Write an enzyme that holds these catalytic residues in place. Structure first.
Site, PDB file in Angstrom:
ATOM      1  N   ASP A 177      52.964  50.268  38.940  1.00 45.97           N
ATOM      2  CA  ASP A 177      52.169  51.129  38.076  1.00 45.97           C
ATOM      3  C   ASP A 177      51.556  52.333  38.784  1.00 45.97           C
ATOM      4  O   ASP A 177      51.688  52.482  40.001  1.00 45.97           O
ATOM      5  CB  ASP A 177      51.086  50.315  37.333  1.00 45.97           C
ATOM      6  CG  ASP A 177      50.289  49.398  38.254  1.00 45.97           C
ATOM      7  OD1 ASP A 177      50.037  49.771  39.423  1.00 45.97           O
ATOM      8  OD2 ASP A 177      49.906  48.290  37.793  1.00 45.97           O
TER       9      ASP A 177
ATOM     10  N   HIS B 227      45.796  40.140  33.378  1.00 47.41           N
ATOM     11  CA  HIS B 227      46.869  41.107  33.217  1.00 47.41           C
ATOM     12  C   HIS B 227      47.798  41.076  34.433  1.00 47.41           C
ATOM     13  O   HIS B 227      47.368  40.829  35.556  1.00 47.41           O
ATOM     14  CB  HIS B 227      46.361  42.525  32.888  1.00 47.41           C
ATOM     15  CG  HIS B 227      45.740  43.247  34.050  1.00 47.41           C
ATOM     16  ND1 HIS B 227      44.644  44.072  33.911  1.00 47.41           N
ATOM     17  CD2 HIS B 227      46.050  43.263  35.368  1.00 47.41           C
ATOM     18  CE1 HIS B 227      44.306  44.561  35.090  1.00 47.41           C
ATOM     19  NE2 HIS B 227      45.145  44.085  35.991  1.00 47.41           N
TER      20      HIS B 227
ATOM     21  N   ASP C  35      41.127  39.537  33.719  1.00 43.98           N
ATOM     22  CA  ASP C  35      41.516  39.202  32.345  1.00 43.98           C
ATOM     23  C   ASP C  35      42.954  38.669  32.236  1.00 43.98           C
ATOM     24  O   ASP C  35      43.461  38.454  31.142  1.00 43.98           O
ATOM     25  CB  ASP C  35      41.282  40.400  31.386  1.00 43.98           C
ATOM     26  CG  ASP C  35      42.182  41.625  31.697  1.00 43.98           C
ATOM     27  OD1 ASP C  35      43.020  41.562  32.635  1.00 43.98           O
ATOM     28  OD2 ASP C  35      42.036  42.665  30.993  1.00 43.98           O
TER      29      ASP C  35
ATOM     30  N   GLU D  80      47.945  44.823  29.820  1.00 41.51           N
ATOM     31  CA  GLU D  80      46.665  44.357  29.286  1.00 41.51           C
ATOM     32  C   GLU D  80      46.803  43.341  28.157  1.00 41.51           C
ATOM     33  O   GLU D  80      47.865  43.225  27.551  1.00 41.51           O
ATOM     34  CB  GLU D  80      45.892  45.566  28.759  1.00 41.51           C
ATOM     35  CG  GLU D  80      45.593  46.610  29.822  1.00 41.51           C
ATOM     36  CD  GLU D  80      44.439  46.193  30.712  1.00 41.51           C
ATOM     37  OE1 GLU D  80      44.491  45.090  31.295  1.00 41.51           O
ATOM     38  OE2 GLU D  80      43.480  46.973  30.826  1.00 41.51           O
TER      39      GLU D  80
HETATM   40  C1  LIG Z   1      39.114  45.711  40.890  1.00 41.90           C
HETATM   41  C2  LIG Z   1      39.839  44.567  40.138  1.00 41.90           C
HETATM   42  O1  LIG Z   1      39.852  43.468  40.594  1.00 41.90           O
HETATM   43  N1  LIG Z   1      40.134  44.772  38.715  1.00 41.90           N
HETATM   44  C3  LIG Z   1      41.204  44.022  38.048  1.00 41.90           C
HETATM   45  C4  LIG Z   1      40.710  42.993  36.990  1.00 41.90           C
HETATM   46  O2  LIG Z   1      40.669  43.365  35.629  1.00 41.90           O
HETATM   47  C5  LIG Z   1      42.332  44.998  37.606  1.00 41.90           C
HETATM   48  O3  LIG Z   1      41.823  46.264  37.248  1.00 41.90           O
HETATM   49  C6  LIG Z   1      43.529  45.108  38.596  1.00 41.90           C
HETATM   50  O4  LIG Z   1      44.391  46.191  38.334  1.00 41.90           O
HETATM   51  C7  LIG Z   1      44.279  43.790  38.851  1.00 41.90           C
HETATM   52  O5  LIG Z   1      45.669  43.970  39.033  1.00 41.90           O
HETATM   53  C8  LIG Z   1      43.658  43.002  40.042  1.00 41.90           C
HETATM   54  O6  LIG Z   1      44.098  43.408  41.306  1.00 41.90           O
HETATM   55  P1  LIG Z   1      42.980  43.461  42.523  1.00 41.90           P
HETATM   56  O7  LIG Z   1      41.665  42.596  42.043  1.00 41.90           O
HETATM   57  O8  LIG Z   1      42.554  45.036  42.875  1.00 41.90           O
HETATM   58  O9  LIG Z   1      43.553  42.888  43.736  1.00 41.90           O
END
Ligand SMILES: CC(=O)N[C@@H](CO)[C@@H](O)[C@H](O)[C@@H](O)COP(=O)(O)O
Ligand SMILES: CC(=O)N[C@@H]1[C@@H](O)[C@H](O)[C@@H](COP(=O)(O)O)O[C@@H]1O
Length: 266
Positions: free
Chosen positions: A72, A143, A141, A148
């Site tokens: 992404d 994803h 969540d 999402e």
């Molecule tokens: C900062 C983070 O953990 N956010 C998450 C949970 O919603 C999300 O935005 C991420 O894109 C998800 O792939 C989690 O990856 P990471 O926690 O950054 O290792």
């Protein structure tokens, strides 16, 4: 599915790095037959990128015949911005290894024609044939990539609108300002990921414990897109200890018996 119950993020990083290296070396890629690796960004894969670079420097892997695709990218973020996924990947991986620039594939979040950009990314993957190993993380969540809640389980690469929860979560990279976080991202689909030969998900921290539970003990559903792994022939989840807190004792017990030799190990 396999679940690898380790203790710390350091162990997880070394386990995953070692898995990728062994897959590559057993594959014996050439110019006509490259190894195709799918890659994520964020906090989760850091210890994995670190360990990968170390092993390369130690001369255990060459990426000369490895082709990469990222999951992404943010829409509308300048490529030069340090928090873009383009910048992240070069700063943390590409700059330190022997991968040819023609072998690097990333989504263009500033493409004038988004549909065409997404379609071409899928064509590019197909021209190689298949992604051999897709590595990723999971959201709070549930994803997978930016697929999402309420994303189709048969989705392809496309634009998606980020959840308020995802933006808050990612704001730690935009100086704790949610307003600074992009609203949209280009993302590979659930279907795209399911087409990979092997999927490896890294799970770190107690914040991911509900997501891990949904993935492992929950039902197939499009609210926790990580649950699609139940449909994949060759899925692996690599976990630290706090991420396993929401599983049943008998579930964890089973995977510990299964993997005792593959983690111990060290
Ligand atoms: C900062 C983070 O953990 N956010 C998450 C949970 O919603 C999300 O935005 C991420 O894109 C998800 O792939 C989690 O990856 P990471 O926690 O950054 O290792
Ligand atoms: C000795 C042993 O048990 N081997 C299995 C392997 O055959 C399997 O594929 C995976 C379970 O995942 P699966 O049921 O999704 O294939 O676990 C183990 O590594």
């Amino acid at each position: 599915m396999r679940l690898i119950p380790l203790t710390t993020a350091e162990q997880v990083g070394k386990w995953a790095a070692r898995h990728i290296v062994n897959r590559i070396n057993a594959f014996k890629p050439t110019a006509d037959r490259p190894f195709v690796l799918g890659l994520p960004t964020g906090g989760t894969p850091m210890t994995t990128y670190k360990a990968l670079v170390e092993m390369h420097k130690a001369g255990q892997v060459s990426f000369k015949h490895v082709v990469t695709f990222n999951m992404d990218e943010y829409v509308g973020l300048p490529k030069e911005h340090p928090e873009s996924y383009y910048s992240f990947m070069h700063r943390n991986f590409f700059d330190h290894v022997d991968i040819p620039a023609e072998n690097i594939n990333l989504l263009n979040g500033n493409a004038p024609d988004i549909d065409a950009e997404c379609r071409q990314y899928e064509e590019k993957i197909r021209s190689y044939g298949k992604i051999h190993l897709f590595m990723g993380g999971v959201g709070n969540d549930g994803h997978i990539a930016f697929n999402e809640p309420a994303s189709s389980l048969a989705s392809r690469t496309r634009i998606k609108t980020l959840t308020h929860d995802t933006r808050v979560a990612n704001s730690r990279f935009f100086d704790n300002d949610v307003n600074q976080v992009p609203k949209y991202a280009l993302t590979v689909g659930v279907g795209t990921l399911l087409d990979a030969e092997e999927v490896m998900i890294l799970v770190l921290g107690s914040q991911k414990a509900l997501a891990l539970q949904a993935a492992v003990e929950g039902c197939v559903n499009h609210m926790w897109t990580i649950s699609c792994l139940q449909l994949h022939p060759k899925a692996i989840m690599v976990c630290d200890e706090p991420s396993t807190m929401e599983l049943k004792v008998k579930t964890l017990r089973y995977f510990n018996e299964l993997e005792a030799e593959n983690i111990k190990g060290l």
